[PDB]
Amino acid sequence: TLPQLTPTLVSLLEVIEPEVLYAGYDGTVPDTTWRIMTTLNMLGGRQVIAAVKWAKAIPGFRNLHLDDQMTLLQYSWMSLMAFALGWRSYRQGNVLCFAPDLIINEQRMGLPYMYDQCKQMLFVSSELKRLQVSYEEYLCMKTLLLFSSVPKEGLKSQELFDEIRMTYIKELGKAIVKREGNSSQNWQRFYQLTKLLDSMHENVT
Amino acid sequence: TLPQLTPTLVSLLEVIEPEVLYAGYDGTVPDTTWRIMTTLNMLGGRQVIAAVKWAKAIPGFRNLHLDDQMTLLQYSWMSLMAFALGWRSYRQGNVLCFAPDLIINEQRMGLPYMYDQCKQMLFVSSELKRLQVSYEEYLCMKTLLLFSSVPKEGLKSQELFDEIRMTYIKELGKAIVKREGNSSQNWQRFYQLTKLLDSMHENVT
Ligand SMILES: CC#C[C@]1(O)CC[C@H]2[C@@H]3CCC4=CC(=O)CCC4=C3[C@@H](c3ccc(N(C)C)cc3)C[C@@]21C
Ligand SMILES: CC#C[C@]1(O)CC[C@H]2[C@@H]3CCC4=CC(=O)CCC4=C3[C@@H](c3ccc(N(C)C)cc3)C[C@@]21C
Ligand SMILES: [Cl-]
Ligand SMILES: [Cl-]
Ligand SMILES: [Cl-]
Ligand SMILES: [Cl-]
């Protein structure tokens, strides 16, 4: 059984949450769309590396065939980064919190080419604010984003994948129960959190 | 009078067309969304620098107040790169020809996250193909895109800007006349090409 320091699967996902990355943005000097995009691209390059590090620490992940591990990251990596982005944003508004030293507030949103590049990602934060998602709900949902990005039958370890996925769904079930207690609305909450997860995989391919 | 080598203002825009930039993309090794986006961001950084050098070579541009020069590039730089992209694509099927060594054909468009990052830019090539735009119409339109990104009333050299802009509008009229000849449909083509320019400035600010 799980040690008392980390007695639930969700508390292991809390242990592997990476430290937030800083963008390296000046902020002493004035903003330009060019400065933001150039810094943002460097930041996204490192967040991809951090997201592969995080996925490889998820309990169960390293037990999939290495082709399955690569396939899952291939089909979910940017969706995972956008989901983390929505959460950070949510926790601070109608802002995009790319990094603590790089927040796209309403003013920066009006810099040229900035809103039209950003608009889509604002969906995520508003849905998390609309559903008042908890930290534990967020950690389960994020792991499931990684595990719901490819059909079981398009993978090599179909059976093991399916079992690990079902474990993470149940852990989400328990984050729901912990937050809002047991009720008839608990299935509704489960429907609206998993539908949210279905949106994040749209427009991947 | 203009020299006989370069007897028209459009033939001066021909002279300042930069040589095409190469992405530096291998293409021996297989494609991934990560490899394309990372290489594309390198290419975009250099294309911005080549777009600033091109604008500083347009007849009239260096005669504006330096604040006016900065403002015009600030409100048009990505629209210009997208417009040049549309034209390269048009000249080369519904592909996005970022560079000769980096073309997003239908296959690469299906790579994860790729179509959704690309879809908007397909508009430009479709309109240029729909209207059968000539190289000379294109060069005039591209300069006008730079000279219509800001109202003159928010500039320091209001009168000079207006005169330079009207010169390039007349140069477009003459590119229109050169191909289609004098017709009742010359004004229709002129509306079509300038409506197209109004789109390219949408979603800037
Ligand atoms: C503003 C803007 C924009 C975008 O071009 C669209 C979605 C962005 C993505 C979301 C997800 C995301 C979350 C972040 O917190 C910062 C970065 C980030 C991005 C950006 C990005 C830039 C470059 C890469 N490379 C090097 C792999 C990865 C991500 C910028 C993206 C693509
Ligand atoms: C796929 C994709 C994508 C995008 O994120 C949306 C529009 C692209 C832009 C168009 C206009 C454009 C035209 C090209 O021919 C290649 C590059 C290019 C881009 C890309 C770009 C990336 C980084 C910068 N920086 C460093 C200044 C500039 C341009 C990628 C853009 C922004
Ligand atoms: Cl700017
Ligand atoms: Cl299996
Ligand atoms: Cl890929
Ligand atoms: Cl003046």
Q: Indicate the residue type of B97.
A: C
Q: Which of A76, A81, A116, A120 to mutate to test the interface with B (most CBs of B within 10 A)?
A: A116
Question: A33-55 and A77-91 helices cross at what angle (nearest 10)?
Answer: 110
C-beta atoms of A110 and B74 within 8 A: no
Q: How far is the CA of B196 from the centre of ligand 2 (A)?
A: 20
Q: Indicate the residue type of B40.
A: L
Show the tokens assigned to A163. Answer: 């079992």
Pocket of ligand 1 (CB under 6 A): A 40-41, 43-45, 47-48, 78, 81-82, 85, 98, 117-118; B 34, 37-38
Show which of residues 61-80 on chain A sit within 8 Å of chain B, judged by CB atoms: 74-75, 77-78
Residue B111 is classified by DSSP as S
Q: Which ligand approaches the C-alpha of residue B125 most closely?
A: 2
Give the distance from CA B20 to its chain's centroid: 13
* Spatial distance between the Cα atoms of B144 and A109, rounded to a whole number of angstroms: 26
Show the tokens assigned to A109. Answer: 């949103």
* Spatial distance between the Cα atoms of A48 and A39, rounded to a whole number of angstroms: 15
* Spatial distance between the Cα atoms of B23 and B21, rounded to a whole number of angstroms: 7
Distance in Å, alpha carbon of A144 to nearest chain B alpha carbon: 18
* Spatial distance between the Cα atoms of A88 and A82, rounded to a whole number of angstroms: 10
C-beta atoms of A112 and B45 within 8 A: no
Resolution of the structure, angstroms: 2.4
* Spatial distance between the Cα atoms of A68 and A161, rounded to a whole number of angstroms: 9
Which of A77-87 are b and which e, b meaning 16 or more Cβ less than 10 Å from the residue's Cβ?
A: bbbbbbbbbbb
Q: Is B99 helix (H, G, I), strand (E, B) or coil?
A: strand
Show the tokens assigned to A41. Answer: 């691209």
Q: Is B96 helix (H, G, I), strand (E, B) or coil?
A: strand
Q: How many CB atoms lie within 10 A of CB B187?
A: 11
Q: Give the 3-state DSSP-derived string for A73-130, with helices as H, strands as E and coil as C.
A: HHCCHHHHHHHHHHHHHHHCCCCEEEECCEEECHHHHCCCCHHHHHHHHHHHHHHHHH
| B41, A43 Cβ separation under 8 angstroms | no
CATH classification (class only), B1-205: mainly alpha
Q: Is B149 helix (H, G, I), strand (E, B) or coil?
A: coil
C-beta atoms of A204 and B32 within 8 A: no
Decide if A107 touches B, using CB distance below 8 A.
Answer: no
Q: Is B202 helix (H, G, I), strand (E, B) or coil?
A: coil
B-chain CB neighbours of A205 within 8 Å are: 110-115
Q: Which of B37, B113, B200 to mutate to test the interface with A (most CBs of A within 10 A)?
A: B113
The alpha carbon dihedral of B54, A40, B75, B69 has a sign of negative
Query: Quick one: which atom of ligand 1 is closest to the CA of A98?
Result: 15
Decide if A30 touches B, using CB distance below 8 A.
Answer: no
| A73, A147 Cβ separation under 8 angstroms | no
Task: Count how many residues are written for chain A.
Answer: 205
Query: What distances in angstroms separate CA A71 from CA A62, A201, B1, B98, one per listed residue?
Result: 13, 14, 65, 27
Query: What distances in angstroms separate CA B132 from CA B180, B183, B186, one per listed residue?
Result: 11, 17, 14
Rg (CA), chain A: 18
Q: What are phi and psi of B97, to 5 degrees?
A: -95, 80
B174 contact partners, CB below 8 Å, separation of at least 6: B8, B10
Task: Count how many residues are written for chain B.
Answer: 205
- Nearest CB to A116: which of B34, B114, B203? B203
A-chain CB neighbours of B113 within 8 Å are: 78, 203-205
| B115, B104 Cβ separation under 8 angstroms | no
Q: Is B98 helix (H, G, I), strand (E, B) or coil?
A: strand
| B178, B186 Cβ separation under 8 angstroms | no
Nearest CA in chain B to A72: B112
Q: How many CB atoms lie within 10 A of CB B103?
A: 18
Kind of pairing, strands A102-104 and B96-99?
Answer: unpaired
